Amino acid sequence: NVCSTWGNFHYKTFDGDVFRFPGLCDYNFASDCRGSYKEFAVHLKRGPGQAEAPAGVESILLTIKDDTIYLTRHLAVLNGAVVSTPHYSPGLLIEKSDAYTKVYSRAGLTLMWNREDALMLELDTKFRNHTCGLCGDYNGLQSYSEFLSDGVLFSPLEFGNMQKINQPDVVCEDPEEEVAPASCSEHRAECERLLTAEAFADCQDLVPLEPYLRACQQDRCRCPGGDTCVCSTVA
Amino acid sequence: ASQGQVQGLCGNFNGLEGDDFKTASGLVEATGAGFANTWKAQSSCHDKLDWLDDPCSLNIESANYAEHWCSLLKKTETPFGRC
Amino acid sequence: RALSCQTLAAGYYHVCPDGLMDDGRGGCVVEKECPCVHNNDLYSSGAKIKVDCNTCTCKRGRWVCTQAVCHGTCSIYGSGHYITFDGKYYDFDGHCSYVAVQDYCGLGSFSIITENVPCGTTGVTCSKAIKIFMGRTELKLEDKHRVVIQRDEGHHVAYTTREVGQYLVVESSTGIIVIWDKRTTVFIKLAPSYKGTVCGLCGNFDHRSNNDFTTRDHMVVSSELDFGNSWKEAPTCPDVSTNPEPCSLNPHRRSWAEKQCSILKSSVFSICHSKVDPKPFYEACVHDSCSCDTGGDCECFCSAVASYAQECTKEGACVFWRTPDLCPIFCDYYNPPHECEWHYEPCGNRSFETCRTINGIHSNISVSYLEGCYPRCPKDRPIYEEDLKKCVTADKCGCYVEDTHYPPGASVPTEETCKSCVCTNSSQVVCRPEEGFCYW
Amino acid sequence: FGNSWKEAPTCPDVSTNPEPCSLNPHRRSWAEKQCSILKSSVFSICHSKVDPKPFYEACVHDSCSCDTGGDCECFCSAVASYAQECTKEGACVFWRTPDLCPIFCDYYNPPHECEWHYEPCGNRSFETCRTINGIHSNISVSYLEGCYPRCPKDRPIYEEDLKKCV
Amino acid sequence: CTQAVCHGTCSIYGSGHYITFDGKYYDFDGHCSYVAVQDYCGLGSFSIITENVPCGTTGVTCSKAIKIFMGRTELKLED
């Protein structure tokens, strides 16, 4: 299926489970914890904090079984060399459109990233019961082991904290537990009206609605003023 | 004055470094873990096996750091250059 | 108090009841029937195994072995990798003629020299010829052939040259053996009568490896580059100062080398991982692949992998690792037009009949572990004559006089006087006198 | 003419043709020595039926360039290209030796029954289970090098998608 | 001789050596996806594309994969 991340630090695993982890240092977005041989690993790197509304990404590291791709805002590097996109190696395709950057692999990996905030990854069915990154496992269970492993219901922040990567030159502090804000249910009508418009007719049966509107709930109240933070969800 | 009268993970101390893996029950082993397992002080412990990998290939973010500093040992101008 | 047949000698310093002890195979057993272990293999009581010249037995969880002295072996291979008689690996990259072994150690009976020349552009050097001085005769292994020189008039110390698998084997009746793969590898084997009476790059073979760095003038040093530099032959040859690092001087060739040489650590050689440590061979493979940068670099790699496969065979693990895309071997080239007799033997464990051994001649070493193509002669002429590589009848093989093959019937050349010789029609060389004065 | 047929507009434009043997002088001596087999007496039959110069130049040009690994695979293909034309015009030449571009055919054989053989110039037509049912091609590919079966007389149909005599 | 029209042949080989259908040799070292053949020539039925990538450090390039479009089917010769 698809793991996704967008908006004001909104995440979505392979089994739904939309939450919010405002980490900023570095994290293991996805990986192959088969144990014998690691086929691939996607590492995400947030920014230093762009502003209150947006939440960008600095660069992405993506290793597939022999080679590393380092994608930045302006350039893409393969094995330490700058490549003029597109590239057509016999086991890997990189292309750079204006609205997206796309990477296709023969192992069953597809990555699509717009250079600002939105990122999504698609894997085949081969990697079920093996993924171990921030996107949770890929067993198809809805929040089964991602948050309730040994009976303890993990809060999103602590679950995200465990997925950190230690860079042996810089110490980065994890975010502290914020005071539980009020359930922003006062803006539910606005989110429902905006999302369930006419232009979104033939997908009311393809994608659910509850998670994406719940995401709009916090987005609307956490992001006062400009509507740069609500229209990044309906996107 | 104790040449050949010691046994353990530190060898026999007789001048030859080929019989160092000589177990306490005759023949010589081939790997480093096979010989070591025979000197456990607690019967309940399990047996280990060698590890055919290099850590500098699994932790890429650390490879540059490790190199940039450990390479100082070969720099003649550095204080270690004297040795 | 819980013994386990592996902590027997430990002491139990820090399940089964009192008496019986765990064996690691299953239920508890008495001390008498306690098994033995070796290279991650579990052998019950009363078993048998061989170690390179001897035979052992699991008696009481302890091994009891015969005590005979195996031969001594020195190895030269790769771009300057040396293994001495007492097991001390090292590296050395010289450009001169160096004393591999000899007996003129401070009056001597032989000497074995080597010729190292540069191969690459990073400064590394490799062996490309061998010279063997025996008494007064001088053999030279060169250009994939053996050349005799200064053959002594009437002493002619008995030797024997033949070809086994992909290797060329030269033995001497005195107790010297040289095995050469025709490209860069060399094995020197010595009988246990030379113990502690040799010197050279291969140490002095005394079962003690803290004094194999003895220089020409009987001084013990601690540096490879000083030990090596003192055994050069021509005084005008330069002196080595530093060991080059190939993969650092050719960064663009690293990616390939580290990918092809990784097969040693793959699952293909999973059987051999518990019997031979692969790291010192993986390092040599990578070191060699980064250096062959002037052509023919698919040949530096196959030999490096074969060096490890041969040891795996020698220790008892016959592994089949060649594929049509990885170091292929072309054996049936030797077959007759379309009769199929030559076969690629992955680990050489075959003992057939030649026309040498048919007449009682026997070697002194087991070379039954060398890779290559081997015959499977048919049942209408089942004797393998070696000097022509031909399956022939037991009658028409040859004579093999003075290390020279002569076809049956052919008038045998003779360096004597008044003595004519002929190979009979019975594989028998017989000589007659001629009274043309001289008599019988 | 070349730069106008690229598919992606963002792809760069070629400005010059590099000279491998000039940028890698130390590899020239080897390349000019191995590739000389084309002009040697081994291919004496084919010299009057195919001009070797454009293939000699290709061999030398390729051998000077494969300078990152596996340069014994750039050379054998270059020589095989010329050998294939020599076969195509009516000159079947046997040039492989255990030291020069060896080929490993008996790998496919069952344990020790000998049925696969290296066919130097492919001039052999046998019965597959496609042609046994009237299926035929529209060109002759009877000049392609490789290893071919010689299926026995008790199951003489060669199935292709498994490489088996049945 | 009899007069029948043989098939036509185009050859790609080596580090960017090309032989056209009419017998013209040349060299070309590109790094992109190039049209080997097609009949959408100024409405056509097929197309054959090639994929050249660098192989070496001197700048030369060689073909490493093929794509065949026929009607709507797409074969890819690779690995």
Ligand SMILES: *[C@@H]1O[C@H](CO)[C@@H](O[C@@H]2O[C@H](CO)[C@@H](O)[C@H](O)[C@H]2NC(C)=O)[C@H](O)[C@H]1NC(C)=O
């Ligand atoms: C194997 O070793 C034996 C032991 O020496 C060799 O036998 C010697 O042969 C020479 C000449 O043939 C005699 O002068 C010696 O007296 C023999 N030695 C003994 C102890 O009798 C034998 O030649 C060696 N094998 C080969 C093939 O040479």
Ligand SMILES: *[C@@H]1O[C@H](CO)[C@@H](O)[C@H](O)[C@H]1NC(C)=O
């Ligand atoms: C494991 O089985 C398959 C993949 O092997 C997967 O679809 C399933 O959801 C997994 N179930 C559990 C309990 O891990």
Ligand SMILES: [Ca+2]
């Ligand atoms: Ca789950």
Ligand SMILES: [Ca+2]
């Ligand atoms: Ca010791």
Ligand SMILES: [Ca+2]
């Ligand atoms: Ca010694």
